[PDB]
Amino acid sequence: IQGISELIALTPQLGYKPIPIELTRKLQLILLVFEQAIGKDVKLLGDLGGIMESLRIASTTNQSQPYHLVKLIIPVCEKAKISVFQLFGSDFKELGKILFGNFSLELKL
Amino acid sequence: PNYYLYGTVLTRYGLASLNHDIRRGNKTILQKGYWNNGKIHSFVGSSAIRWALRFYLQKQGYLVNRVWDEEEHINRLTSEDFDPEKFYDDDIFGFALLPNQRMGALGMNMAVSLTPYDGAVKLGAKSGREKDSTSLHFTEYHATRYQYYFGIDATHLKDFSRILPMIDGIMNLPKVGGSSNIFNYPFCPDSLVFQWTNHFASYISYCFEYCDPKSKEAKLSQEFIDEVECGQIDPSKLWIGGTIVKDLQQLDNFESSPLNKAHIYRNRNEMIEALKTVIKRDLGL
Amino acid sequence: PNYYLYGTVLTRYGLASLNHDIRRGNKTILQKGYWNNGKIHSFVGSSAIRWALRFYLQKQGYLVNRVWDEEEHINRLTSEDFDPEKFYDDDIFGFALLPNQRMGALGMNMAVSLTPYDGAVKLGAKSGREKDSTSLHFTEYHATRYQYYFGIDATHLKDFSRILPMIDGIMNLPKVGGSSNIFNYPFCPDSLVFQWTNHFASYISYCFEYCDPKSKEAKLSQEFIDEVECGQIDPSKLWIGGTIVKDLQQLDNFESSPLNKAHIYRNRNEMIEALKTVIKRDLGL
Amino acid sequence: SEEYVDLTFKLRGAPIPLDNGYLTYAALSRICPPLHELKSIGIHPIAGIPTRNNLLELTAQSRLKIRIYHQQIPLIYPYLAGQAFHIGQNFYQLDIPDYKPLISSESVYSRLVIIKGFQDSTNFIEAVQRQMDNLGIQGKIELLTRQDGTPQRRQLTINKEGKQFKVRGFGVKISELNPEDSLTLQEQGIGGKRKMMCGIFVPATRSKEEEET
Amino acid sequence: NSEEDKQYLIFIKVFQQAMKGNFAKIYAKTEEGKDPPIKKKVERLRAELNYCYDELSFKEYLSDFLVRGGLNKYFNEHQEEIALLIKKSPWQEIRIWSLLAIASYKPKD
Amino acid sequence: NSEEDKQYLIFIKVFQQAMKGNFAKIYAKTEEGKDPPIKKKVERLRAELNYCYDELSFKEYLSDFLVRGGLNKYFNEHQEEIALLIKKSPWQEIRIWSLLAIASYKPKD
């Protein structure tokens, strides 16, 4: 409910029509962060394998195809410990920095 | 007289993505290791610099066994048997067939980044045939200046005159790596420290050091300054130049310091000409 | 009277791949083994250092039974029968025929890496395409400063005057057998601890220690300093020279310590000249 | 030098007007929101073979080139890598970008520079000299001339809202910079309208290219 | 019996299943009559396993291999045991177990 | 009888089949009329087998050699037994068994 509320509340504040590949590449960036975190810690694979496979499938299918909100995006940002507002609102730099801090990675984009 | 030319040359500041490693899962990780103070530093393989020098030699005449196609990316041997007497490449870098197995005059060490490698991953999207798909991958880049060390056994050369093109190639080094050099990173040195002596003992291996990643001044290590001041590294045998000379000349007590009597030039080409005159005098060229 | 010169010597910091064991399938494994505190350290064979010293004696004139061809990469004997009286090589290093078999005046220990060795294996490709069995190859390297101890029985020398060229070679040590084409590691000393005495009891073994793992501090072991202070290791017989001198002089109450009464020289050549003068006095040269 | 990068995209599509500054800028801002707020960004003129009707026919060497600080690329790469935009009713496609360095040259050149309130050539030279001093730069100022020798002015048509405003500028060639100052000039530029596809400086060969035709 | 050997055997099975998934992936990649590269793939896997320099190296590698294998049922039932075994034990021992597993996959098919 | 001896015999067979695979590999590698190095290869194998310094050494080599052998049916039939035999047992006895296998592969050809 909080993710859907953030999704509704964020649309008027964007100021533009969202670009599909912007969202697709944000999802891909989250996938890369997940992969690096798994590389650092093997146990996290048990918690994130299904979501990893789902994100990989969503990034292999046509990008113009929409993504299932509650089935895919909300759990993905949940495991990434990121609000829907942060996912759809922050730029790539802020999103990458927050992801790296969240998974304690040493990367810097 | 067994003459040797050792030197540590330093490059200009810029982005580097030169010698990527096994690329674990998605990131073309930059070749990194441990260095002074136990902080991770990025490296550049010495074999890449040797290949760049060989390519430079092949460019400007200088009959060379290994010709770089530049189109099919295939090395072709001009002659099957290695002949260091006739070819610059076999004379300088040696060879190993597995004949003669030349030891090779030039010795090199890998280039070590001046500042520690902290972060700086970059976004790189590679294309895909899957209905025009673009999968995002990572690529490490480093903003630093690479210094490396090299030694020339001038007596080991079959033709003593072949040393002269080598210094030019070091000064006019071509692009290192080539395709994987994402950002075109020049390897022409911006500050040189050359010691042309006649004994095997060699300091000044890694004299350049600044640390403090916030800036890019590329100072000189206190250890090298102390070694020069103590009495070792005879100043008449020391050739120093580049932007580092501009910093050195501003230093107090520089005139009184033994560093002054060392052969020092603001311009690098002045170093090259004076040193080449010295070599041609000493080698009877 | 019997006289013995013992010395612990520390090399310069850099990247080294000097000794390789077995070449598992693609890596040239750096010669490594357990050492102090039970972590793997890389090693440099003492036989390699003996070869380097013999090559030094060959280069700077002198008479040697074994001649390094440098072109055929083969060893040639001037005379099939060894003669320690004439040749420096047979007198200093000894010889086995399988005659006299000598004993060898120079005795050396294997060189340990000051820094523990963790990782740092180098990649190795080749131009591009038409890749064969020799296309891919890895290579191990260690960023450390090697240290080895040695000792020589001066009385055992057939000619007592031959001790000076040996010390000169230890100063200007040529390349130590290793992949110098891509890893040029200068083995010239930067810190010395010599003991010229008439006793068989040889303290001042490996004493140089690393303050911080993965760094290049190279401070002096607390056990060695305590041994010097306690009364043993007579300071008048102690010969210290190198970069460690600055660290020693920055130690507190150094003047009150018995170490200050030892022969210390920040410059290496000054200490070498003083030691050779003392040796010439004590050998009637 | 390498501290700044020129982002290059293999650009293909319909032929484009030769005063297409605001058109391409608006299209890019449409397909890239963060471009609308960045500061140190600039776009190189799009090369090609022109036509008789003041339009440029894109060729194989035609490419969209963007000057940007290397610490801001990840804010632009997602929205342009492989992306396509529309200029009016024309479709344009960009490939995977490649990075090009900022090389120094003995002499530099700019196709179009505009500074507010300067229409005559002499006061334009004075103002370019003033901005030239403000950057700590040394050189001599020359204006690219037509076949007649008259200094060549170029015009930018900003079609903001219903109206459209006219801004006229000059081509400026500056030589004897010394490579460090040359790099400073190419990275700073003069004119300010670098988002407006004007102020980027280029080595002097393109000046000859534009002077021939 | 001897629970640590049970962990070792389930690690063997997990590695075998992951490489089964990787083999299925590469079989899917190839098309038409060219022989799918599998002996070459086995050689590559061995060489990449041999190449490592302790701790982080070969641990990121094992995690990435398990991820690219796909969904591992044995790993799913044995998340905690496998993760604890991987985190502990000398990495050389884990490499030896992985090499055994390599040569142990064949009875699967 | 004495199932440990059965495991020892099947390990001998496994090592023999692995050396058969490596012999096939070297025979494939050689070209022209050059004599394929077999005596040289056998002596090299024996020399490397004698050279070893406990646990990690020679066990890494055993695993690597078995992988180099490739498809081996005798190891396929019995997974857990041979895996436990390799992980357990003093390495010197495994060396004895492997050297006996060196001399007992020659029955195959």
Side-chain angles (χ1 to χ4, degrees):
Chain A
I1 53 187
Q2 189 172 355
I4 291 170
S5 303
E6 281 181 359
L7 172 61
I8 309 146
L10 170 148
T11 308
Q13 302 168 22
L14 287 161
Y16 46 67
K17 175 160 298 320
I19 317 170
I21 278 174
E22 165 185 359
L23 180 52
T24 290
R25 293 193 167 158
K26 278 183 175 178
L27 286 184
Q28 293 180 356
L29 173 61
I30 292 181
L31 179 61
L32 308 172
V33 171
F34 278 170
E35 289 186 359
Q36 301 302 321
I38 283 181
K40 272 198 177 188
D41 185 312
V42 60
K43 150 74 64 162
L44 297 178
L45 179 48
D47 319 333
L48 310 179
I51 276 176
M52 180 146 288
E53 190 67 29
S54 300
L55 265 176
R56 178 177 272 163
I57 291 168
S59 296
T60 50
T61 67
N62 156 261
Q63 298 78 3
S64 82
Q65 289 199 344
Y67 312 103
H68 310 86
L69 169 63
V70 198
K71 143 187 176 186
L72 175 69
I73 305 99
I74 293 171
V76 157
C77 62
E78 164 61 10
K79 288 294 187 188
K81 278 204 293 213
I82 288 307
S83 77
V84 168
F85 176 87
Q86 284 164 326
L87 167 64
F88 287 94
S90 298
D91 61 30
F92 269 71
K93 256 206 176 69
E94 297 144 351
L95 185 67
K97 172 138 74 73
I98 299 170
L99 287 162
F100 301 155
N102 261 28
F103 286 99
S104 304
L105 297 172
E106 272 295 348
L107 322 173
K108 280 182 186 184
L109 92 177
Chain B
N2 268 267
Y3 269 105
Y4 284 101
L5 170 62
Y6 319 83
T8 290
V9 307
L10 173 56
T11 65
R12 213 189 191 168
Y13 194 87
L15 324 171
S17 291
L18 272 162
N19 226 357
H20 303 302
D21 315 49
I22 312 296
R23 197 261 334 283
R24 203 74 42 170
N26 319 273
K27 31 185 317 177
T28 60
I29 81 192
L30 195 59
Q31 198 171 181
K32 44 189 162 296
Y34 270 99
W35 198 235
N36 317 338
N37 315 137
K39 295 155 314 185
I40 314 175
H41 280 249
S42 43
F43 303 147
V44 177
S46 51
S47 60
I49 306 177
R50 300 178 120 261
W51 189 95
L53 260 184
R54 176 192 267 90
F55 185 52
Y56 167 95
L57 280 188
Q58 175 214 330
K59 280 318 283 180
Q60 319 185 355
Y62 299 155
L63 286 168
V64 152
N65 231 30
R66 286 231 329 264
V67 173
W68 184 233
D69 203 286
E70 307 169 30
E71 295 99 35
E72 326 306 313
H73 294 264
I74 166 62
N75 271 182
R76 314 178 191 273
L77 291 192
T78 54
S79 171
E80 203 285 337
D81 289 351
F82 295 91
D83 179 25
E85 170 271 358
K86 183 171 105 35
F87 294 106
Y88 279 57
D89 186 62
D90 294 357
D91 196 11
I92 286 157
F93 303 93
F95 46 84
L97 178 133
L98 311 172
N100 289 338
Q101 318 320 284
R102 178 151 180 73
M103 156 76 207
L106 173 63
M108 192 96 58
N109 250 329
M110 301 165 28
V112 158
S113 60
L114 210 53
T115 85
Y117 162 78
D118 46 5
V121 72
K122 83 166 281 274
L123 267 298
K126 72 172 182 175
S127 166
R129 41 86 183 171
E130 312 172 354
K131 205 173 158 100
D132 181 74
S133 55
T134 64
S135 184
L136 265 176
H137 74 266
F138 269 8
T139 285
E140 295 182 345
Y141 75 96
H142 196 188
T144 171
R145 334 152 80 85
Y146 284 109
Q147 54 165 315
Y148 61 92
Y149 169 77
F150 77 105
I152 317 176
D153 184 12
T155 317
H156 199 48
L157 290 166
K158 282 309 189 68
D159 188 10
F160 282 74
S161 68
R162 299 205 164 115
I163 171 64
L164 293 173
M166 285 201 4
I167 314 180
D168 306 341
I170 294 168
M171 295 307 343
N172 324 117
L173 203 55
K175 177 142 71 72
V176 168
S179 80
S180 76
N181 183 203
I182 300 332
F183 320 86
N184 279 345
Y185 193 59
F187 252 97
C188 64
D190 85 327
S191 52
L192 316 153
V193 173
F194 279 1
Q195 176 174 2
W196 167 262
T197 179
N198 72 327
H199 46 236
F200 304 87
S202 196
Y203 304 103
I204 79 164
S205 51
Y206 278 120
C207 37
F208 282 118
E209 156 267 301
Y210 171 17
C211 190
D212 322 291
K214 314 168 189 57
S215 300
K216 34 185 177 300
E217 313 313 307
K219 232 181 179 186
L220 218 34
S221 64
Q222 182 57 50
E223 293 284 44
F224 168 69
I225 290 181
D226 272 285
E227 268 190 335
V228 165
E229 166 263 350
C230 287
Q232 323 197 220
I233 330 179
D234 189 40
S236 61
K237 316 291 199 56
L238 205 52
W239 268 275
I240 299 178
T243 166
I244 191 60
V245 160
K246 177 173 307 175
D247 194 6
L248 281 186
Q249 286 185 285
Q250 172 298 349
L251 294 189
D252 49 354
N253 313 2
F254 183 81
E255 315 288 342
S256 60
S257 165
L259 203 57
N260 202 179
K261 41 204 68 49
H263 298 268
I264 173 178
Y265 305 97
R266 264 298 293 106
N267 173 16
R268 269 165 293 108
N269 295 350
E270 301 181 9
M271 184 137 30
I272 293 313
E273 292 295 340
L275 182 59
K276 281 169 71 176
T277 293
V278 167
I279 315 304
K280 294 165 64 185
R281 175 166 54 86
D282 291 4
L283 291 200
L285 313 181
Chain C
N2 283 47
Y3 276 123
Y4 291 109
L5 159 68
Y6 305 113
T8 301
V9 58
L10 175 63
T11 59
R12 286 198 47 89
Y13 195 89
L15 310 164
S17 292
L18 309 178
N19 269 122
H20 303 134
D21 303 69
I22 288 284
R23 182 233 88 181
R24 287 291 143 89
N26 271 345
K27 314 186 191 55
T28 54
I29 305 82
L30 206 53
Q31 164 67 78
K32 45 166 158 278
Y34 280 104
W35 187 242
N36 174 22
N37 292 332
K39 297 167 312 312
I40 308 196
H41 284 248
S42 68
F43 292 139
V44 179
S46 49
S47 56
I49 310 181
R50 296 173 131 260
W51 193 95
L53 255 192
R54 185 193 269 90
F55 185 57
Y56 171 94
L57 295 186
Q58 157 167 337
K59 293 303 279 187
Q60 298 190 350
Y62 296 128
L63 293 186
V64 298
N65 218 355
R66 286 221 336 265
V67 183
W68 185 229
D69 191 86
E70 297 191 26
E71 229 192 330
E72 304 298 315
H73 283 273
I74 193 48
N75 261 341
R76 306 183 175 279
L77 274 308
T78 57
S79 170
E80 63 287 348
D81 292 352
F82 310 89
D83 172 30
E85 309 281 338
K86 179 179 25 178
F87 304 123
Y88 292 68
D89 179 27
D90 294 351
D91 162 5
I92 282 155
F93 300 90
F95 49 90
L97 178 131
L98 314 183
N100 300 343
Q101 288 73 318
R102 217 170 140 64
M103 152 56 68
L106 158 65
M108 208 138 43
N109 233 354
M110 223 172 63
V112 306
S113 59
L114 195 33
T115 320
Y117 164 79
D118 43 27
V121 54
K122 172 59 169 25
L123 255 176
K126 204 111 29 115
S127 283
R129 304 176 181 181
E130 307 74 32
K131 296 181 174 301
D132 66 50
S133 68
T134 86
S135 180
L136 200 31
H137 67 82
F138 306 95
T139 298
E140 292 201 303
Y141 69 93
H142 194 6
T144 173
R145 31 175 59 238
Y146 288 107
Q147 152 207 32
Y148 60 103
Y149 150 88
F150 94 106
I152 49 185
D153 178 16
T155 313
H156 198 82
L157 280 167
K158 278 313 178 68
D159 184 14
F160 291 69
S161 69
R162 306 201 160 116
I163 188 141
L164 327 166
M166 263 193 35
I167 303 183
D168 288 1
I170 279 163
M171 301 335 297
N172 319 333
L173 200 52
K175 101 150 174 57
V176 167
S179 75
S180 178
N181 59 330
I182 58 180
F183 287 107
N184 198 40
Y185 197 67
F187 224 76
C188 162
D190 57 22
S191 36
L192 305 163
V193 168
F194 281 1
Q195 178 176 16
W196 171 263
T197 186
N198 52 349
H199 306 99
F200 301 77
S202 183
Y203 299 95
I204 84 154
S205 53
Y206 309 98
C207 45
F208 301 108
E209 62 177 350
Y210 66 102
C211 176
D212 174 28
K214 327 190 104 313
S215 299
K216 42 181 301 302
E217 175 64 16
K219 53 183 196 75
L220 208 41
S221 58
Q222 185 48 53
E223 61 92 21
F224 163 79
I225 302 179
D226 264 290
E227 273 209 333
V228 170
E229 170 269 343
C230 94
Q232 217 164 2
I233 318 187
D234 187 31
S236 69
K237 310 292 206 58
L238 209 57
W239 279 111
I240 302 175
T243 171
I244 188 55
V245 166
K246 156 194 290 303
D247 169 37
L248 280 191
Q249 291 163 346
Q250 301 323 304
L251 288 186
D252 51 87
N253 59 52
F254 172 67
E255 315 311 305
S256 65
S257 161
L259 259 183
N260 189 28
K261 304 159 190 148
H263 299 257
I264 86 164
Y265 296 85
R266 170 53 182 122
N267 177 4
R268 292 177 263 285
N269 285 340
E270 293 168 6
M271 95 84 81
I272 283 308
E273 290 321 302
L275 180 69
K276 272 157 74 174
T277 294
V278 171
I279 278 154
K280 289 160 71 173
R281 291 192 322 95
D282 291 1
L283 282 191
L285 307 179
Chain D
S1 173
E2 322 93 300
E3 334 179 7
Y4 276 85
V5 201
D6 283 18
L7 213 38
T8 63
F9 303 77
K10 282 261 215 251
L11 171 58
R12 321 167 301 103
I16 182 77
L18 282 155
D19 53 338
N20 65 314
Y22 195 85
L23 309 181
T24 177
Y25 166 77
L28 287 174
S29 161
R30 276 203 302 278
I31 72 167
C32 176
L35 184 61
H36 190 76
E37 41 271 39
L38 264 39
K39 329 297 302 302
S40 301
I41 191 139
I43 320 87
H44 185 296
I46 298 176
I49 286 179
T51 68
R52 328 281 81 71
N53 37 1
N54 285 311
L55 317 178
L56 185 86
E57 178 262 346
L58 298 199
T59 82
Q61 297 309 119
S62 300
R63 63 190 68 260
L64 160 83
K65 174 180 303 193
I66 295 190
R67 186 151 299 168
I68 194 45
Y69 192 19
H70 88 107
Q71 290 204 88
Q72 292 164 320
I73 309 174
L75 298 182
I76 311 305
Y77 189 102
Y79 307 93
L80 291 294
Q83 291 309 65
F85 65 78
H86 281 94
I87 290 176
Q89 288 314 65
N90 316 126
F91 209 3
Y92 284 129
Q93 165 54 2
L94 318 171
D95 76 323
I96 298 314
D98 316 318
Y99 303 89
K100 282 299 174 327
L102 218 56
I103 185 50
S104 73
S105 171
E106 172 46 275
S107 180
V108 297
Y109 140 76
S110 176
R111 174 251 171 181
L112 194 182
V113 168
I114 51 197
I115 317 174
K116 208 226 307 186
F118 282 80
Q119 319 299 298
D120 69 278
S121 60
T122 296
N123 291 325
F124 204 76
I125 287 173
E126 181 198 309
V128 84
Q129 174 55 46
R130 195 150 42 256
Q131 269 202 40
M132 211 283 253
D133 319 295
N134 288 340
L135 294 172
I137 286 308
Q138 305 321 312
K140 304 164 191 93
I141 285 92
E142 305 159 11
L143 310 190
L144 290 313
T145 65
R146 324 139 55 91
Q147 17 275 317
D148 52 14
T150 306
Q152 176 76 74
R153 287 178 178 82
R154 328 265 200 181
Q155 181 143 344
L156 163 62
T157 309
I158 176 174
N159 63 7
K160 169 60 205 312
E161 205 29 79
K163 27 179 176 166
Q164 94 253 190
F165 315 112
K166 306 310 181 305
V167 280
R168 289 77 47 200
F170 296 81
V172 152
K173 175 166 181 297
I174 311 175
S175 302
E176 314 88 23
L177 304 314
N178 153 29
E180 167 268 340
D181 272 351
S182 182
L183 293 176
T184 317
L185 197 44
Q186 323 186 45
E187 163 295 335
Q188 301 296 142
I190 296 175
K193 304 284 195 190
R194 266 160 273 292
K195 294 184 261 143
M196 284 338 304
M197 162 56 108
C198 329
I200 164 163
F201 271 87
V202 179
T205 313
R206 175 51 91 80
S207 73
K208 296 144 205 62
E209 305 190 357
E210 298 271 344
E211 273 159 301
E212 288 145 335
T213 296
Chain E
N1 41 42
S2 38
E3 83 305 333
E4 70 290 14
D5 319 58
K6 308 174 194 156
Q7 324 309 333
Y8 160 74
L9 290 168
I10 85 188
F11 172 83
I12 288 309
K13 284 173 191 150
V14 157
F15 194 91
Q16 290 192 35
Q17 191 58 38
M19 88 180 337
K20 186 167 187 172
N22 275 300
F23 289 176
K25 279 185 158 59
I26 166 175
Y27 273 71
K29 280 163 189 169
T30 173
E31 87 296 333
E32 159 277 358
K34 31 196 204 161
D35 159 9
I38 284 305
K39 174 199 62 184
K40 258 182 56 186
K41 180 50 191 276
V42 164
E43 182 79 321
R44 167 144 57 256
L45 196 32
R46 186 284 298 285
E48 262 172 358
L49 261 204
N50 175 25
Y51 166 84
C52 36
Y53 31 100
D54 163 48
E55 273 319 275
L56 299 322
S57 83
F58 166 86
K59 284 288 201 38
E60 319 206 331
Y61 185 74
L62 201 51
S63 61
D64 290 8
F65 185 74
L66 288 212
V67 152
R68 308 318 271 256
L71 291 203
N72 263 344
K73 330 167 310 302
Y74 304 110
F75 189 36
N76 294 342
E77 329 312 315
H78 319 94
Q79 299 288 353
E80 304 72 11
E81 324 168 86
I82 279 311
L84 205 59
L85 173 63
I86 289 286
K87 165 254 176 185
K88 97 175 172 206
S89 312
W91 63 272
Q92 305 88 322
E93 291 309 89
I94 290 116
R95 172 162 59 176
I96 297 202
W97 304 340
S98 306
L99 271 196
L100 300 157
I102 294 277
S104 310
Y105 168 76
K106 325 158 179 146
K108 191 80 62 189
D109 267 293
Chain F
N1 45 7
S2 180
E3 67 89 17
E4 283 87 322
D5 298 36
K6 305 298 119 164
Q7 296 177 356
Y8 150 74
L9 289 167
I10 84 184
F11 166 84
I12 272 178
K13 283 171 190 164
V14 163
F15 201 90
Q16 289 180 19
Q17 170 65 312
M19 151 194 319
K20 183 186 209 190
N22 269 297
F23 283 175
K25 174 174 306 317
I26 173 58
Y27 270 109
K29 193 162 210 273
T30 177
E31 94 295 1
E32 309 163 339
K34 279 273 170 155
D35 183 359
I38 298 304
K39 198 163 187 185
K40 301 259 233 186
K41 194 33 172 73
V42 164
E43 295 214 281
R44 162 165 171 70
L45 183 40
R46 173 210 141 291
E48 302 177 306
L49 266 194
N50 271 326
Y51 160 79
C52 34
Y53 31 99
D54 215 352
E55 201 50 26
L56 324 187
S57 156
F58 154 81
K59 207 173 288 294
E60 272 195 289
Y61 191 77
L62 183 68
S63 58
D64 217 303
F65 186 54
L66 296 187
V67 171
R68 261 187 176 82
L71 266 279
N72 57 350
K73 322 311 297 201
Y74 310 85
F75 186 37
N76 294 356
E77 327 296 330
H78 321 124
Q79 298 309 137
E80 300 84 330
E81 299 78 350
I82 291 310
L84 266 304
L85 191 73
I86 298 312
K87 182 197 196 204
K88 294 181 168 178
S89 306
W91 63 287
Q92 304 89 329
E93 321 188 291
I94 292 162
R95 167 133 57 100
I96 309 283
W97 305 339
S98 51
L99 283 154
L100 285 173
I102 310 289
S104 64
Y105 158 91
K106 315 148 163 172
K108 172 177 276 182
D109 268 295

